Design a protein around this nucleic acid. Structure first.
Lengths: 315, 299, 315, 299
DNA sequence: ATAACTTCGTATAATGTATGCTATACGAAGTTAT
DNA sequence: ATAACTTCGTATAGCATACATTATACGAAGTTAT
DNA sequence: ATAACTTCGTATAATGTATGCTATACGAAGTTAT
DNA sequence: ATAACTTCGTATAGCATACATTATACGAAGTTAT
């Protein structure tokens, strides 16, 4: 069909309308789906409902998580819907098997996971250890951890900060302007206040690195084995390296991980959010304020992160 | 008709897409609706709008709650979506009657009901009455109440509890932890970790632990009812919530939890709620909830 | 067209799906529109866009309010949409003239009106005067005014209360259950707490009237010239009489109205809402709580009811 | 084509359905889009999707804000709805590009701007500098600033103020009420109640009251700009908000109003807001607004 | 030679909610050991 | 017979997941100034 | 005979919000009295 | 000439009203136990 070829060419040509992560997973699912179709002598595009159902069961049988199985279906749905075609999910054979895959796996004990928490006590501990270091990598890392906990920003947002995005309060506290997040894409954006303590950690980093030479340099950059920073206004410190800082900091304090293979055995990119949430709840900060602080325009995710009547039952 | 044959095969093949409780309800609504169709000379499948409308009015006449009538329509809608057929709810007729039936029943003064509170005042009173009893069933029945009150767990949740899951149940009170021990002793459930914590107790007075079979939720409701009949005698003279039942401990738990005064999201995470709707409805007739105008008028 | 005849017959047959006020205005607009069409040799059903435009201009020229002109268009839109036909508003000639009618009238100084407020001071004043009366009509009236101010319920809701809808708190405060309102139609409904003061006023009314003989008797009923109440479980005290109480109470304290002809010269059915709102704001009750109290699931209307920097500009 | 002829006649007949400001913008967007179409050999009416898309990219290249590009599309959409024609926004192409253009400009670090605060610190400083001046314009300019700060009225609102509407303006400060009097005297606006409170003042130094003509909002913006140039000299070295302008007094008013600390719905009803969005954005970089985590970290 | 990355691919979390699904209710028929 | 349940059917109260992306998680392989 | 209604018809308020409409911004061309 | 504006065009920030009912507002005419 011609319309399908054009609808597809129009999405491609304007791929920037979507996140590059959306594109990477579109292709990754398509490889995986194409691979399966090839094994089974099956036509991979206009995907056929029954073929998709079998493929999802196949993923279930490979022991994959329910949310990953949902990702595959989702990308397949998108590809078709934007092609002008009906979704696999528009057929009962696929909608029904997806429920089934969910209900069975859940009933077998499968559960989504959460980032191990990075809380105030952790930050205070890491800070008391590292704040005496004159190594430039230690000063960067402490400043990062501090921003992460303070703001609840996601690692991709922290990496996108440039020097010029940093303003100030009357009191001297740093304010960081954030344009794009996962949930919002506007020119207003949001602004994030830093405590005087975290502000100092950041100032010290700016001072030792020299990132403020260009207002367009990214606040965070790499540091090579000789403690010399490498500011850049066109390449950012990768979110993988930001993950590494979290992981290195955990290892510093707790040693090496298991060889179990499981995720979330050490701090990760989302550890400061899970932990700042818990800390606010524990401090009696209001449920709306917690939401305000970590960009959430609704309860739920906060609830999962925050999870004794016995107090009452006694006299 | 082949596309409905396939769709019905799709349904049967992936039946595990829905709980067995869902299926029973679907089946129950279909029997009822088919029976009516025959009685009244109508074809039950595919459901035509004028017949569904008339059927809904018949259910109204029969005296059923708006929510019940919504169940019958919803199951009918499901039966048609998982065939290739159009939902009766999408006919203009059925849409209109359901608006009518809803506004018309509320006018007549129909009200949602909810579990008669089982509160501290009631738990202590029961504790008193059968604390110094040596009958196994009394010992089991105090343990159950203790857990239901203190945990706010639903009855299906409590039937699945196993002794290996144990005080912390995957947090209990002082005197509730002691009471669940006195049952555990006399019952002998500790013998297999994979035994269910609660099990039958027969007329001889001996307990029968089991890893394969759990106490039915009906039995657990029975414990609440028997505890009410014990005190207040044969159930009130033919409607609902005239004695305690499953949720009674949940409803009553929160009422004391708020009457004692503590954050609502503390209450919510107690029962595992995340949509305050329901917790508010349980707690609503308490003097702490009377709102700004009472506070202003009293000054 | 047959479909049109059936679509119309289906709406009629299930008219109970709509409020009887919706039906009364459907017919009232239809009379008015039919009358105009007849004057001008014009077919009134399937209404023709240009005919409708002329009719709205005609209403503007008769000096009617913008919201009444909108009511006429609205009922005409409903009639057609539920008939299966396109709305007059679906045509540019009608959408455009409606904007114009709004913008011009507003620009000429026309403004929507509000109920004159019935506030705490008014209630205290009326109460101090009438609470010494042994007339049964005075006891009813004081109890009504008190419920109206306490609950912010609308007059139709107050009239629909039956004795059995009245429960109690531990403290002794009356609670009234309300099923249907303007905004909601559910079997849960809402419940409304009464202060101890207002509760007493109500008890006294129950005692002198004898409305509690039947739990199905309406709380409020008529009282004849000899002070004998007439409880009923099938006829309610009309909302027009409830309006009269408000108007009689105003006259008692302030005397007769102007002969200007304007609305809102004395208290009315909505006077207790406008006034309880103002009182809460003035007392620093939270904006969300005000909303909670008068059934509003959103700000705006509260704002209009609640309407010196100079405090700040001075030292 | 006759149905578009009628629809365009519908538009012209009921033109008062839209403000003249709306019409100017519509006209401005149409000229621009027609000019482009000719330059690039495309038909400007009816707008085909691929051409609108290319036109939107051209606007991006031209360096315009996402909000500007939304204006051009919106006016084009209006032009097509009030004809019988389909909105270009409803083509898949245009939908995609607008997503792209938006995400792509935010990436590049484009930011909404807003009026440079005019706050107490600034009002007192200006008061100082031209309080003891006897030039009419200085006396008028202090009165205007006084009102703008104290009322938070928009400039179009202030141009329409008449002396019969007057201190209460259908509430002013002590020293602002005094300053508006000293202008009223020297100006002689009190002479006709239907004179506008603010009027021109010519190079000779005499005022010209008028009931028919008001000060343009451009003049009122001019008062803000002249007051900035007076102090800080020729405007900052080619973009926006480098001096005060219309809303400057509004933005600056709330900043002090919150820095001084008072309820946000008090602030909102001051300026006539009812959607906190904007008031929050003005007040946001103040130490009182730094949120729970700063409060927690500082302990 | 190696610290400290980057780039990459599979894997999976997260982002809000309305009404479609799944719970409890409870009279009562059925079942089994005492 | 019957206590003390289980299974059932159908009433009614009460949760949680499908939807369309966009983000992180983490081992591994390539990179580059020391 | 009349208080205290009821019923009724025209008239109009109210009920929530998203993005379509209407504001301000500001360089600059045009205008008029000094 | 030029101060001190107004009119303009096009940029960008910021409100408010169309949508589908459902309710009240109030004078007037009919009603009914005193």
């Amino acid at each position: 069909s011609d319309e399908v070829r054009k609808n597809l060419m129009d999405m491609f040509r304007d791929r920037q309308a979507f996140s590059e992560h959306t594109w990477k997973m579109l292709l990754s699912v398509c490889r995986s789906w194409a691979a399966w179709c090839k094994l089974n002598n099956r036509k991979w595009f206009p995907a056929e409902p029954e073929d998709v159902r079998d493929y999802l069961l196949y993923l279930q049988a490979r022991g994959l998580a329910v949310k990953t199985i949902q990702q595959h279906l989702g990308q397949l749905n998108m590809l078709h819907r934007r092609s002008g075609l009906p979704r696999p999910s528009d057929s009962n054979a696929v909608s029904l098997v997806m429920r089934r895959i969910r209900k069975e796996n859940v009933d077998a004990g499968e559960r989504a996971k959460q980032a191990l928490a990075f809380e105030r006590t952790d930050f205070d501990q890491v800070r008391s250890l590292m704040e005496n270091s004159d190594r430039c990598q230690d000063i960067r890392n402490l400043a990062f951890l501090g921003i992460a906990y303070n703001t609840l920003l996601r690692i991709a947002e922290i990496a996108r900060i440039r020097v010029k995005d940093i303003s100030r309060t009357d009191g001297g506290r740093m304010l960081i302007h954030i344009g794009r997040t996962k949930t919002l894409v506007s020119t207003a954006g949001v602004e994030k206040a830093l405590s005087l303590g975290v502000t100092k950690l950041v100032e010290r980093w700016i001072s030792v690195s020299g990132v403020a030479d260009d207002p367009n340099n990214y606040l965070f950059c790499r540091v090579r084995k000789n403690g010399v920073a490498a500011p850049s206004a066109t390449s950012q410190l990768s979110t993988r390296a930001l993950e590494g800082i979290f992981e290195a900091t955990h290892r510093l304090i707790y040693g090496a991980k298991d060889d179990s293979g499981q995720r979330y055995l050490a701090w990760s990119g989302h550890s400061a959010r899970v932990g700042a949430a818990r800390d606010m709840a524990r401090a009696g900060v209001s449920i709306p304020e917690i939401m305000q602080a970590g960009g959430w325009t609704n309860v739920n995710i906060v609830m999962n992160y925050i999870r004794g009547m016995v107090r009452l039952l006694e006299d």
